[PDB]
Amino acid sequence: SPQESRRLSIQRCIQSLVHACQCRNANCSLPSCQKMKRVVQHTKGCKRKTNGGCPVCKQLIALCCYHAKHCQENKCPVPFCLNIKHKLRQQQ
């Protein structure tokens, strides 16, 4: 199962995604939160993003997609989650 290491890296980083989307302090010292804050601050202000082909925003949204695929919370703290959940229903 060579997919195991990649699938584990995806879900591990998604815990950091959830944390950084609910974290009560923008200055949080948690190494994973600190790293997540950069990509989070990027995608929310990027004048290009996935619409224009920006790779950074796409890497973040790929994990938001994996999360949303398995998620079901109608008010989930992740901003992209709920959008992907609604988009998935259009594919049926």
């Binding site: 997919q3 890296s9 591990r12 010292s29 994973s32 600190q34 890497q59 994996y66």
Partner: protein, 42 residues
């Protein structure tokens, strides 16, 4: 206890985007690695 020690998941974050640089501008997550459906037409 005055600061955060470490987090086991940070090794999974760092390979995508570390504290030093925006590695996500050149990295490409192989999302296709997710589990397939329980059956298909084949």
């Amino acid at each position: 206890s005055h600061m955060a020690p470490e987090d086991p998941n940070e090794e999974a974050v760092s390979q995508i985007f570390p504290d030093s640089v925006m590695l996500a501008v050149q990295e490409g997550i192989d999302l296709l690695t997710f589990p397939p459906a329980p059956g298909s037409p084949e």
